Design a protein around this ligand. Structure first.
Ligand code: NI
Ligand code: NI
Ligand code: NI
Ligand code: NI
Ligand code: NI
Ligand code: NI
Lengths: 566, 100, 101, 566, 566, 100
């Protein structure tokens, strides 16, 4: 019995050696391996395989998975593979071959009466994204991020207040407690950041004991060497992460003075290119250091013809500068530089910048972390060709390097990779299903802890779920007590030990951060480069080993006008 | 009017079609959501006029051509489905390969 | 450019390789159509299908997973069967086996 | 003192012998009896009857009702009567005459300081509908069904997953637990169905102990004689109902083989006509049997000029058949038959089919169970004239026969008639108020357990609640803790005994199903016919006692374009 | 170091002697005092004052505020002053000078690491409004009132039922319990009113023990002297307030008979002008009495060219009168009088009417209490000029007199002024921030118990929160458990003592009403006038000390077409 | 169409602009929300046409004049900001002092 490869791909999705274009980009993935036994694929439907005594077995619930995603094309940092995925108790159980061991060979994912089916043939499955630069300006950001494929949000804020508009800080025990209570209502995993800017350590320990998983040092609260040293000393004691937005004004010192204050301790540098904030014009040189985990925020990704024009008039409204005063124009030409914006794209392609993030509603777009990551990968393929690590006639390595930037690398940086960040056994089943034509833009299904949380849904009164209008609507995984079971609130070790969850009557599942101080640049998956980088104080030119690092701005991008109504 | 949720939901589809109608009038090549909205709204008005399901399954294939949409848009739309109140109640119209 | 397009490698895939197979002639003696799926225990199909049931014990249709063979009333055809694998335990269907073999 | 009958009807609603047209149909109801004492009617408003010492008495809360619906025209399986309705502790207290026993005669519903008033003069009041074929594809179905007049939803699913798109199954203890938790958030009473397709009884007992009130046997999971026998054996042990979608393919046997496997045990056959699924072409013959409770799903109700055209292209998308392959066209002409669709309408009129249901977003329309039931009654009156049971110059008996199909008969079938399904003393006060011009289409008020849950509501900022735009909006009975007090989650006896409600921290009121195994066709109110029915294997013609059963398709229906914006 | 006053006002908001126009009215406020030390103002932002060691100190959370509103222009009954406002533990901590005592002088509001910042320079801050005439017709009224600047709602009802459409009554223990449970879901503080119309005191005591904070006596339930006496006797025993809508029909007696039944006991007269209800034509004379706290409802505020036309056809639909019957036209000319509507505006200006309120969706507009209060003040300034109490070239006294009508006076009347109603130390931090151009119309931020509850918010996916469309969206203070911590449910003393909050599992913070019986007209802040008022039985002319009290109708108002889309 | 929340939110802005467009056509002087909606919608259509951010920052100042709006409306609008999908992705357009 034989089938043509074209008919096989139409029924079960692609197999080994077949290639798929990602959305409307020039990126092609090639299936590296396929865990099936040809002829034994499981398919659900009228007269299909998954039926009593056939592809479905006689086992009790304890001996089979709760959910199987059939014939998935997995794209993750470790491989691009065709396999079935099994989920049990809200966690990833196995990546392998599903079915009934009574009549089928090589079954590692048993399907029984207790198993639900998601048909993933012809779809791409990825881990849920992790955005670590959220400003909690409004709760509506959670649904916007979730629809985009982001399932964990780390950040700070109290709502639309001046402090939060500017910084990712949830200030003090009272607001930390209230925001942890509000977090139970949102269908994403959440961790909060406290205000790190203080020179008295007890004012920081109080915030960590209240529940924050990190501290943000922001220049708007004074990013001085004394405050940086204080926050890092506390972070080393309490195993939490520090995020930094450095002194753009060079008021307290230059970039080398900030780096000396850090003193080789682990830190996450936000918007490392610098438009989002930081020592002018050379904060970008921080990516050379082994203890620095560098991220980009998204408006500078990728460099386009309209980037500067929006950025030059963005900074003029944010800080109320006005183009009439010469000293404010000199300040505008200080955070906004064509030279560092263009270099940042290349540094992502080389693996010198390790994470992508939004900077939500505070010089960043909450629904565009994933889409912009892929637009940078596309523009780099077009300008630079194949990476040196690339094997075969495909972009598999570039794809693995870029997916790590919004999945596993933010998880490792924030001490939550034991729970989320990748499709690996034992991790929370936060999964995103994509049709290849809409990859990175509009997902087909977003799963939170084993339950569908949001999905495109057609007319509620229709005879099927596909008729128009189709728009994203919350599902059962986003409702009340089911939502509480399917999401995590992350706490510091001190807060968990002190019974913060019981005192505040938090309803969601709780997880604890760990391993924040031992992570270094060498641990960033596929993005561990420490370049010998310099920035010219006069021209702002970025050089790596004396070679100019630059790129050309795009006039048109993929994942843009073909897909969006506005 | 005593609008039910399904009636309010169809107002969203009608509004999205107005956006597309105005862009097509300017001479733009339509994108994916604009094309879906425009064809869907045409079908709902055909049901209101009292056209049959069989007539609309055919007429819906002649609203937009490949020359009026962006590259790849026809392949992104293998079919369009929409329900509306015909004189004989709600019915489903499925238009196969609407853009050629 | 077609968004999400495949570039499928040309060729063929061989199904259920290295497994025991047999061919049986089947005739639908009923007055209503019968359709059988790829993984159904062939010896326990609708009694109106006439064939050597002893030869079909422990076998299923040797066709792509999730496909079917249709038998219109009075239709006769030769089908190819492939042996079950795994534990080779049959439960369900018409309740004729309910155990190993 | 005398008043003309025309002036009386304008002030208090119709009385004995007056007739009312149902919406824009040809159906007329005649008031059979009136429980008032003429001159002693209660009316609320400025200078009206319900006032201290007048129509309102001096009694304490324990001695008066919480809510009175004044001057209601009740339409229920037992009568079409004019009466006041009293509600106390969320339940129906009495059907009778309201007022103050201190000054009024024949008062059976005392009104006191603790009584709220709903003015029902000129309105029709019915029980809330019960839809037993829900696919839990999305939570938005609950508000859509509630707005239509359905207050109880029985079904299965986990969200928009392949298994749920096709079947009413909530598979396994983990998903059953999560869906019971999600049910607290929805303003309808809910019972869940598990996956019945397995040949090992312990895999079924586990699901019933987790909380399901029934098991669905669906052909997409293998509707074989062994799985049917297994599910019925467990149902007989645990007092739960089995719902069946039989083997359309005739893969395991023909309809007579399925009926032999059932072996005279009680079962609910879904979409008994067969377009929705079942032995081709003769599953409809199941309505002859005493142990079968047969329902229809709604796209085939009533038979119209566009029915086939939508159905022939509905099945082609649902199963991905394509009109090019001849064997798929032979399969299309196998579930979709003009002959059985046309016969089904008549079998409803004769009382051979006992229930109506949706099959929500899975070959069925969730907001149209009630509307389509009345469209069938109208088309049958037009084609067939008066029923043999009809007395008087009215359609009272036909109306009682049809209302039973979506109220009491689904309640009896699913073992919940002790709590809901009719306007009878002691039952939960799930009531729907209709203006006669909008009967069956758009209700005036939907009451859940004694509180208004949803209603049309005008401009929130207006000086009155009537100015435009008027659209359905959730009320206090749909909010948080008040919603929990006003809805029921139904559990199996095993789950209630095992403390499932306490373990899952369910917040809503709990009710237990009972009497699922003893109900038979003879118990179906006004719909107990067991016809001697045959289906010709070649032509598909349906005959009862050798007489052809057919009907003509409608070109135009009532309850359609006059009422809906789209 | 010197700065011009114009540059100072642009950076920090106005100071002593500067004037501000309220929205597009002719009302001007003058800054009376400024609590700052010039040069030591706190400002937040990049390179600004509130930074570690500068304007932010080293203190622990217990020693600094949770939130500071910087450079606010406060408008309250006690003054129009420029100051910083500190909030701690959800309550107002201090009105004064914020900063860091380590380097700044005269600091009374310490800012530390635990402090969030709201930038109020150039904004007006007021207390949240208190509407005491709510009909709970639908829950959507809560968001509408909150967006308008009202943070406490007192009223009665059960949803869209005839009793509630007409009266502010929550009848009986069962509905009182359900509405207290529903109140946890709404982002406003709530107190409920029971049905006061009964002549048996135990039927009233039962309702107060169940949780109501007052009793409404409404003519639609019989506003007879026996029912009034009964409700007041119970109110005197249980320290709750009575609200009265008197006998318009003069069925039981005239206004003097109702006043004799009251017998000098404290009572709140709703819609004292009378269009909203009351003895025709002279209920307005009740404002002469020391024990009467008189309010207006809002459709008659101010008198305009369209007032009567809407009111004459409003009463014709509400009571179903019809213009054909002469006795119904005589009834229409009985509640609707040009003479009392025109006099009411003047009586507000003189301080004879003390409160404003809506009468929500029952002859009143829930989102217009504040806007209409300011339109009356504007029309009175235009017609009457300066008040006799006015000092300076400004309208400060008129502004203090009018703001008291919807803030402190409703709070004193209902026994809740210990918790809310003004910007005073120890009170709940329910605060509203306004841009002067939108004062009274569209607020910039609404704070509930120290958390932002609702605010205008731009595109969720935008790079900043200001891009279009900007519309009001709920914030974190309106979500789940954070909402419960930030709102109050008011109970009677009896209900609190009896453990009603624990029995019903109420989740919100609880407060108890007190001091309802001792409040009198002389306690109404800036609105204590007891005029010698008469109404001519034939012409309806209102006279005070024999002088005709009248006003001219407006053809155009401010706070209207310049601001609203419809 | 698979409309995201941000796409649905922009439908509200488009509808508000339709209200304003019809009133301006009647010869009315526009108010504050009408003026904001009309200018914002113009910018979104300019982005759809493929105009640059710099061109729209200037062109947006010539949609409405002081004579077409109510007294005080220009002073109530110091700037208008809106984002839309340009050919090169989402960008922010800020129009300073749009009504003169
Ligand atoms: Ni920053
Ligand atoms: Ni930021
Ligand atoms: Ni079915
Ligand atoms: Ni179904
Ligand atoms: Ni009143
Ligand atoms: Ni009222």
């Amino acid at each position: 019995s034989n089938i043509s490869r074209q008919a096989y791909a139409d029924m079960f999705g692609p197999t080994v050696g077949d290639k798929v274009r990602l959305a409307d980009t020039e990126l092609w993935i090639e299936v590296e391996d396929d865990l099936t036994t040809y002829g034994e694929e499981v398919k659900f439907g009228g007269g299909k395989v998954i039926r009593d005594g056939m592809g479905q077995g006689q086992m009790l619930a304890a001996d089979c998975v709760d959910l199987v995603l059939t014939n998935a094309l997995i794209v993750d940092h470790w491989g691009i593979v065709k396999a079935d995925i099994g989920v049990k108790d809200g966690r990833i159980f196995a990546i392998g071959k599903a079915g009934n061991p009574d009549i089928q060979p090589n079954v590692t994912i048993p399907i029984g009466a207790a198993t639900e089916v998601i048909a993933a043939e012809g779809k791409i499955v990825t881990a849920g994204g992790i955005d670590t630069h959220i400003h909690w300006i409004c709760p509506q950001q959670a649904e916007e991020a979730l629809v985009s494929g982001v399932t964990t949000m780390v950040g700070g804020g109290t709502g639309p207040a001046a402090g939060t508009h500017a910084t990712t800080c949830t200030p003090g025990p009272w607001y930390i407690s209230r925001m942890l209570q509000a977090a139970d209502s949102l269908p994403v995993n959440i961790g909060l950041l406290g205000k790190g800017n203080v020179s008295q350590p007890d004012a920081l320990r109080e915030q960590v004991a209240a529940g924050v998983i990190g501290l943000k040092i922001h220049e708007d609260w004074g990013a001085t060497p004394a405050a940086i040293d204080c926050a890092l000393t506390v972070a080393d004691e309490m195993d939490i992460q520090v995020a930094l937005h450095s002194d753009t004004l060079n008021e307290s010192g230059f970039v080398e003075d900030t780096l000396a204050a850090i003193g080789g301790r682990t830190i996450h540098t936000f918007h490392t290119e610098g438009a989002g904030g930081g020592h002018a014009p050379d904060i970008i040189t921080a990516c050379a250091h082994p203890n620095i985990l560098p991220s980009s925020t998204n408006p500078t990704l990728p460099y386009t013809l309209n980037t500067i024009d929006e950025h030059l008039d963005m900074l003029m409204v944010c800080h109320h500068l006005d183009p009439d005063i010469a000293e404010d124009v000199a300040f505008a030409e200080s955070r906004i530089r064509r030279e560092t914006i263009a270099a940042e794209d290349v540094l992502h392609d080389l693996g010198a910048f390790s994470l992508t993030s939004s900077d939500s509603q505070a010089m960043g777009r909450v629904g565009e972390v994933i889409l912009r990551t892929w637009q940078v990968a596309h523009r780099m393929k077009v300008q630079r060709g194949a990476l040196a690590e690339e094997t075969g006639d495909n972009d598999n390595f570039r794809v693995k390097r870029y997916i790590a930037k919004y999945t596993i690398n933010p998880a490792l940086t924030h001490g939550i990779a034991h729970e989320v960040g990748s499709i690996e056994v034992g991790k929370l089943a936060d999964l995103v299903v994509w049709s290849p034509a809409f990859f990175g833009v509009k997902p087909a299904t977003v799963i939170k802890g084993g339950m569908i949380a949001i999905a495109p849904m057609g007319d509620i009164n229709a005879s099927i779920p596909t008729p128009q209008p189709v728009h994203y609507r919350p599902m059962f995984g986003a409702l009340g007590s089911a939502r509480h079971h399917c999401r995590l609130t992350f706490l510091s070790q001190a807060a968990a030990a002190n019974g913060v969850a019981e005192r505040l009557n938090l309803r969601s599942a709780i997880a604890v951060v760990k391993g924040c101080r031992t992570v270094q640049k060498a641990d960033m998956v596929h993005n561990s480069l420490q370049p010998n980088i310099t920035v010219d104080a006069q021209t702002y030119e970025v050089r790596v080993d004396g070679e100019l690092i630059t790129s050309e701005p795009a006039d048109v991008l993929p994942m843009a006008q073909r897909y969006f109504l506005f | 009017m005593e609008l039910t949720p399904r009636e309010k939901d169809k107002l969203l589809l009608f509004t999205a079609a107005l956006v597309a109608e105005r862009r097509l009038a300017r001479g733009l090549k339509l994108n994916y959501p604009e094309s879906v909205a425009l064809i869907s709204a045409f079908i709902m008005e055909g049901a209101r006029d009292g056209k049959s399901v069989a007539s609309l399954m055919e007429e819906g294939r002649h609203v937009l051509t490949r020359e009026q949409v962006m590259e790849g848009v026809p392949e992104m739309i293998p079919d369009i489905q929409v329900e509306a109140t015909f004189p004989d109640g709600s019915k489903l119209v499925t238009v196969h390969n609407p853009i050629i | 450019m077609i968004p999400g397009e495949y570039h499928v490698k040309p060729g063929q895939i061989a199904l259920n390789t290295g497994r025991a197979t047999c061919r049986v002639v089947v005739e639908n003696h009923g007055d209503r159509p019968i359709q059988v799926g790829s993984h159904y225990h062939f010896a326990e199909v609708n009694p109106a299908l006439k064939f050597d049931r002893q030869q079909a014990a422990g076998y299923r249709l040797n066709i792509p997973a999730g496909t079917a063979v249709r038998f219109e009333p009075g239709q006769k055809r030769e089908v190819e069967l492939v042996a079950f694998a795994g534990h080779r335990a049959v439960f369900g269907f018409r309740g004729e086996v309910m155990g190993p073999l």
